[PDB]
Design a protein around this ligand. Structure first.
Ligand SMILES: [Mg+2]
Ligand SMILES: [Mg+2]
Ligand SMILES: [Mg+2]
Lengths: 354, 354
């Protein structure tokens, strides 16, 4: 546990990419930049409005960083949706990412949650006030079924953040806690269902494939992020309650065994993704295919995950995995490494002061 | 379907009951009757009101049977809460059950779900109109955190019923579908959180134990019901899409292997329940202890699960399992076998016509 399991990590990462067939796509760099800028621009203007600037307590620099990371996530993974959809989704997922900065006990503001909701009064918690006011801009892109999924997952996410304020990784022997919490904060159904705008897909005609994608993508999605984040989190003494770390505490196993568990679930989830959707509606496999690749690309190109540090270490090694990794990484960079100055401007703060 | 694994059913059921050392002593015959009648009486008066009689489309006989089954469930398992709490919970879980066996398509009534919610307008779907109007009577018994859990779980349940209308057990190879659906319709967080009225428990002082109980009780609860109720759902059309049966379809394994999977999860969940809460706050272990026993007692007695039939077929067999099964089944009846005429009166229909 002293050193980072670099060789084990590379092997699992290469397997993950091969299982999902990571490969070049029709999604260019020019289109990338266009979408990045469109999504960023609309979002930046939104978060710069006085109402938002005042009810959303976030350090300007992090809001800027969080927005940029989210626009990147949406644009790179929701490759098939319209520019407006990427923009509105970027706003919503930026709201979720930001809420992780509040130490404010939701308790006082949640005392009248239901009565206020039923009466049509603005929620006491400012996050809810902005999120629910903006939600319709996100929901207009989806049918009733998918919309319900986005709504539920966001409600779950809120409770997840609440629970996480206690920095609790679960009582030893509480085996069901880890994944219980991970689903709470994962946004699985929100992500999964938001992949099907009614503009491109008929919710009723594809009810079964969509429901199935939500169910399978929920886990793939969160576990992939748990793994790709495993490098940056490794020595992060601040980050104390990740799925992997709660496995250690709750299941009473080594950090290493927790990481074995995570990669097995991840690889298996990847296989089944392919096995189930390969022969289904081609348009559905396309969206699923593009999300998995873009999602990994995003993790690979975003400084946040510092995976470039791993590339800079096996860059010249002559091992099988090390080379497959470096090639995948270069492919990723080839289309995903983009300078912020090419799309993320002007800064939110500059629009807020204007 | 074809032929019920009666033999194997006996073995699995005996293993669970034995492992959890099934024994109910939550109430003296007299307290059982008092609570049953109190809960039934308030609920019956509620469902007999003209508004309820009009928006709730349910065959009168079915409403009557469902109400009686639920009052029994609540009273027998929520042994530590007040009479009012049992009554209000009985009303809520009766609403869910009436939908649980229903056959309706939500799409047209869910098109304006969010906008109506945000504006404070009554929901288009009549079930939501009655449930949300009544909810405050249930929520007043809990703190904000637990309340949030009840609200979310009910929202999940609705989507679960929606999904089940398609009679889909999952695509072969979609291993994550089964439990995905089971949590949707399980009411796990609703049940788990509703075990802690603020009248008896401080939500903030026991935040960790309550959150943990919600996480562990979610699975224990649903799996126990899946095992105990495998019989009544086996041939029912509306219940052909269940956890055990979706395991067969989705994982491509024998009905028998699905059963072995279910009992292992159940036994293990039982083991960890004890391991984690034995030494924790005694009042918490008491509620957890009382729910598990009362819940099982309820299953061996309520009409809905028809476990009497399985008894009237093995009460002779010299199979050891059929013997251990009948000893348990008679033990349950001795404590919880109560004639409806001692509490469930007058009938809802008679109050409706008055
Ligand atoms: Mg159900
Ligand atoms: Mg049912
Ligand atoms: Mg059942």
């Amino acid at each position: 546990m002293e050193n980072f399991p670099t060789e084990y990590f590379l092997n699992t990462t290469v397997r993950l990419l091969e299982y999902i067939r990571y490969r070049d796509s029709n999604y260019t760099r020019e289109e990338r930049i266009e979408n990045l800028h469109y999504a960023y621009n609309k979002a930046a203007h939104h978060f710069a409005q006085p109402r938002q600037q005042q009810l959303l307590k976030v350090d300007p620099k992090r809001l800027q960083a969080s927005l940029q990371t989210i626009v990147g996530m949406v644009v790179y993974s929701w490759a098939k949706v319209s520019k407006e959809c990427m923009a509105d989704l970027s706003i919503h997922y930026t709201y979720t990412l930001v809420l992780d900065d509040s130490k404010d006990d939701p308790y006082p503001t949640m005392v009248n949650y239901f009565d206020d909701l039923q009466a049509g009064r603005e929620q006491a918690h400012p996050w809810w006030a902005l999120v629910n006011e903006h939600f319709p801009n996100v929901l207009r892109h989806f049918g009733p079924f998918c919309s319900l999924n986005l709504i539920r997952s966001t409600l779950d996410f809120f409770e997840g953040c609440w629970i996480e304020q206690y920095n609790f990784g679960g009582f030893p022997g509480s085996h069901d806690y880890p994944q219980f919490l991970r689903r709470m904060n994962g946004l699985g159904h929100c992500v999964g269902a938001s992949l099907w705008p009614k503009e491109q897909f008929n919710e009723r005609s594809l009810f079964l494939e969509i429901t199935s994608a939500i169910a399978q993508m929920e886990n793939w999605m969160v576990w992939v992020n748990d793994l790709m984040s495993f490098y940056k989190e490794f020595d992060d003494e601040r980050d104390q309650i990740s799925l992997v770390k709660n496995y250690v505490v709750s299941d009473e196993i080594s950090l290493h065994e927790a990481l074995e568990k995570l990669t097995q679930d991840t690889l298996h989830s990847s296989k089944q993704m392919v096995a189930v959707f390969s022969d289904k509606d081609p348009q559905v496999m396309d969206t699923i295919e593009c999300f998995m690749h873009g999602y990994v690309t995003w993790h690979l190109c975003d400084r946040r995950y510092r995976l470039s540090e791993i590339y800079e270490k096996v860059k010249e090694e002559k091992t099988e995995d090390a080379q497959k990794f470096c090639k995948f990484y270069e492919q990723a960079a080839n289309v995903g490494a983009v300078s912020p100055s090419e799309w993320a401007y002007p800064p939110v703060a500059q629009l807020a002061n204007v």
